[PDB]
Every structure is written in structure tokens, then in C-alpha cells.
Design a protein around this nucleic acid. Structure first.
Lengths: 53, 154, 118
RNA sequence: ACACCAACGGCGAAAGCACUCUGCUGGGCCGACACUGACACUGAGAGACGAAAGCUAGGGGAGCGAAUGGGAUUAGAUACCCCAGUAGUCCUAGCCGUAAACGAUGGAUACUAGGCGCUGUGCGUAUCGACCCGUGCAGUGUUGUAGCUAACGCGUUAAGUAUCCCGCCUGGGGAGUACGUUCGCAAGAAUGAAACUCAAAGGAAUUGACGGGGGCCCGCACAAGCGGUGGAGCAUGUGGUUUAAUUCG
């Protein structure tokens, strides 16, 4: 689940924006809080239903 | 900003030396509408400074106020619920205006003799590093750069 | 004096309340550390990005005795001190080699309370 | 407990069920057909299954967390928030059988305009291709039509048009409680009143307002800035007090 700095060159550029798309605070804000058990399968799938079509 | 555009409000220039930015110093030291005696506060501080310094009175005025002129100040903006102390960078139009406000107050908050000596003292005290005029430049820098994280770079 | 270790991993424990920046060697032994609530300000004034740079820039006073040339970085956990800690270490004097994100990604089991963060 | 894959996905009668593997096992669907032959549908009582919480006995217990103990907030908070934390949550066996157990629209069958998304199978110059044209199951949304509906809305997975059978309602409060019977270890569950009292409860939708709802916009409104008040002495006005009245608004 790490990040690539496989590119050479003595460059000082961050390149931390490449992993801030898939991983980000997104996989940690979906987690680290409290799970609703039933509202996670209801409310989180209800807003994605109307935003699809 | 879009509806109704006003550039700036300007009056007549400096007496015989000709300058519009120095004419704001006679307009801020203006007490209750007396521009006739406000002329005697600036032009007598130009007559008494030539003995303390060597060069022209327009040069020593500009070389000293650069130590009173700020680069960054704090403004109160709220977002989300909490009041953020976000620092916005001050330009050359508002920075020259903020320099003459703290040199005005420092002159009045020193009850010695007349205003001809009080303005002339705080004019050379900005070059060496003394008085309440130069202290406010380093005091606004204590509020700024400490809250640097609330504002992102350009 | 000093051990004089070449390169080493920099574990940055980036959290919401503060950020603990610790520069360790190749094995896992800590030489000296630096934190956000140590560098002057405390309470809630830390955890911010430019408060993390004064924290990571306090380490180069205590670890300068060893004399490290190159340095690998390692960030752990979310917060406003992920990209900031990397910028302070770069302007200090030490080189870049391996920047990695070893943030513990859960397999959806253990869940802490809701609560609002800073 | 099990990321990602996960999906408006799938399976199951309902509840419900997701890392991988093995063992035993159920249901659904399609296709050339082969066979029985209506052997069907529904169904009071009855029997069985039941999210979580809770209960009994024996285990287990990382995290979370009723209770409980501190810190904080507040006029007070024996709440929200912070630090800890027991039963419990997990496993085996038995028990309790309730939930917005909700699509709140019981099951089964035949019909009635259409336009986009799954899974099986047939076919399409030899399938040359991601694919193209059909034909079934289950499943969403649709400016969804007719029709239906109080309206919202539903719309061949319709509350459309009909048939078969079972359950249920016939004012609000009192009540889903009391009494009795039955069931349970217990907490309680199931069946189920009346007196008295009101003339109203209730549903949809409409106008406006309100919102510590949202989107976009205008006034010193804030912001930027100057002077000022509240301090002081004096003037004046008002309450309170006082007085025979300290006249009224």
C-alpha cells in the first residue's frame, strides 16, 4: 500500500500527489470512525443511486 | 467590485516639492479640518531634519519609513464555525498607508514638547531602531508567520 | 564521539493532534527525536503544516553530531503534516532516497469513535 | 472481523448471508428433449424457522461498549464531549419469540402502450471483432402511457383490468393497558375490555411564514477608516423613590 519514488534523478519534487488519488485520506475517513452496520448498506448506497443516472 | 468601480480619491499634491503619496501624511495628521496648520507640522519637520541628517528631506523620509512599512498583516475571516486568523499579504498601496498611521500615533503618544519635534524624532528613530513607530512593524510580524499555516503560498 | 551511520529511515507519525518526526538508522534504533508539542507552542496551535516544519527542523540540531549524508523518509497516518515534514528535511541539508507511506490500512474490523477532529 | 474486488451485484420464504479451501446438503434457471398426467391453488387450528437486545450452564474475551468512576461544558446536566471501564458483543447447548421483522402494497394464475442497465441458451461470411440479431429467469430507474388514486404517486416485479383462497379494519384518548386463560427461568409475549371523556384525531396537497437548510444577490450592515458614547462636570428626558400634588400620554 506504499508509494513509488522509483524514478531516479537528484530532484527535490514531492510526487506525493500520485498516491493522493487512490489511497488519500479517503481509505482512512471511510474507516477510523464508527461503523453504522446497517446505514452503511442503506444511506451510502442511496446517494450513489440518485447520482448514477 | 464589479458593480461600481472607484480607483482612488486624490486631492492636490505636495506644496512645492510635488508628490501625491507624501500628501497623505498631511491628510492623516489632519485634526478636525485644519489643513492650514497641518502644513506647519510636516513642513517644519522638514526644516528641522536637515541638521540631524545630510541628504534631501524627501530621501530621509523614504529611507526611514521602510522600517515602518509592513509586508504581511492579519485579517479576521470565519469559515466553518471557528474564527481563523488568516494572514493576507499587504501591497504597496495599503502598505504605505499603514506606515503613516503608526508614525502618527507614536508622535501623539509622546507628550514632550510640540508636534514639530514629536514627528521629527519618530522620523530618525525608524532608521536606528527606537520608538513606538518601528516596534509595531516587528509586532505585526509576531502575529504573522506564526499563523502562516492558515494561508497557503502564492 | 558519535556512531557515524550513513543513511537512515525517518518515521513521521502524522496524526491530527500533533506530529512526531523521528529520524532512525538502517536497523530501527532511534538516535534522537523531535515533536510538535515540544517546539515552543502547545495545546492546539500544532498539528498544522507550518508547525510541523519547525518540529522537523529542530531535529537537525541534535542529529548533526552523527553526520548523515543521505536519508530515506517514511510517513504514517493521516493529517496536516504529511507533505510538510518532507519539505523541512529537504531544505535542511540531507538528501532524498526513498519516501514511503506505511499507513495502517485496516481490513474493516476494529472501529474507533466518530468525533470531530482539528 | 475480515480491505480491495462489492456493483444501481447476487442468493434465500422471512430473518438473513460476503477472505481462501475441503466435506455433507437445499433451492432457482435454461436447453434438445423423454415420461406421468392435474397428482392443482390457497389455507383457521397446528408444526417449524426468528435482527438485535435479554436469560440459563460451561468456555473465551483484542477492540468496542449499557452500567459505573473521574475531567470538562452549563444557571443546573446524575447528557452530548474526554480519559478508563463491567455485563454484553464471540463459541457450544437450551430458552425468549419481538422490530419503521417495511416495497409499512399475503400467496397463486391469466391479460393490458413503450424507451435504457444483469444471468442461460440459439443464431449471425467458418463467431473474422470489443461484438450483431433473437429467445427465457431474476432485477433498477423511467418526462413512463392508458387506467387507477383524495393527492402524493403506482404503472404489465402496478395500489391497471379480473379470478381462487386466507389474514385484518370499521372515531381519538383510555389500550394494545386492566382482568382471566395460555406460554416463559425471568424480563415479558400472545389473546383482549369497559367506565369515563372529546368532537375530533388522521392523510395528501396548497399559500405564507419560520429554520442555529441550501444556492445566488442588495443597505456603514460588516469589513477598511475617522470621530464619538459608556468615565468626568453640566443640560435635558425617563423609570424607581418620595410627596398634599409632584398632573397626562
Amino acid at each position: 500500500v506504499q508509494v513509488v519514488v522509483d524514478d531516479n534523478e537528484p530532484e527535490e519534487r514531492l510526487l506525493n500527489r500520485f498516491r493522493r488519488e487512490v489511497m488519500r485520506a479517503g481509505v482512512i475517513q471511510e474507516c477510523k470512525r464508527r461503523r453504522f452496520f446497517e446505514n452503511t448498506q442503506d444511506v451510502r448506497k442511496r446517494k450513489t443511486r440518485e447520482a448514477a443516472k | 467590485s464589479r458593480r461600481g468601480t472607484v480607483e482612488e480619491k486624490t486631492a492636490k499634491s505636495d506644496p512645492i516639492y510635488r508628490n501625491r503619496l507624501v500628501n497623505m501624511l498631511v491628510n492623516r495628521i489632519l485634526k478636525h479640518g485644519k489643513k492650514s496648520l497641518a502644513y506647519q507640522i510636516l513642513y517644519r519637520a522638514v526644516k528641522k531634519i536637515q541638521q540631524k541628517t545630510e541628504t534631501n528631506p524627501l530621501s530621509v523620509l523614504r529611507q526611514a519609513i521602510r522600517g515602518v512599512t509592513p509586508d504581511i498583516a492579519v485579517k479576521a475571516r470565519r469559515v466553518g464555525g471557528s474564527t481563523h486568523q488568516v494572514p493576507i499579504e499587504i501591497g504597496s498601496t495599503q502598505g504605505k498607508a499603514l506606515a503613516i498611521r503608526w508614525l502618527l500615533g507614536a508622535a501623539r503618544k509622546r507628550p514632550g514638547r510640540n508636534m514639530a519635534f514629536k514627528l521629527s524624532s519618530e522620523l530618525v528613530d525608524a532608521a536606528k531602531g527606537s520608538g513606538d513607530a518601528v516596534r509595531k512593524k516587528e509586532e505585526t510580524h509576531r502575529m504573522a508567520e506564526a499563523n502562516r499555516a492558515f494561508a497557503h503560498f502564492r | 564521539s558519535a556512531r557515524k551511520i550513513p543513511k537512515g529511515v525517518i518515521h513521521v507519525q502524522a496524526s491530527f493532534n500533533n506530529t512526531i518526526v523521528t529520524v532512525t538508522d538502517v536497523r530501527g534504533r532511534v538516535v534522537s527525536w523531535a515533536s510538535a508539542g515540544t517546539c515552543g507552542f502547545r495545546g492546539t496551535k500544532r498539528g498544522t503544516p507550518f508547525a510541523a516544519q519547525t518540529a522537523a527542523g529542530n531535529a537537525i540540531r541534535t542529529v548533526v553530531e552523527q553526520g548523515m549524508q543521505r536519508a530515506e523518509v517514511m510517513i504514517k497516518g493521516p493529517g496536516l503534516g504529511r507533505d510538510a515534514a518532507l519539505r523541512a528535511i529537504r531544505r535542511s541539508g540531507i538528501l532524498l532516497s526513498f519516501v514511503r507511506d506505511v499507513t495502517p490500512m485496516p481490513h474493516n474490523g476494529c472501529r474507533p469513535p466518530k468525533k470531530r477532529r482539528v
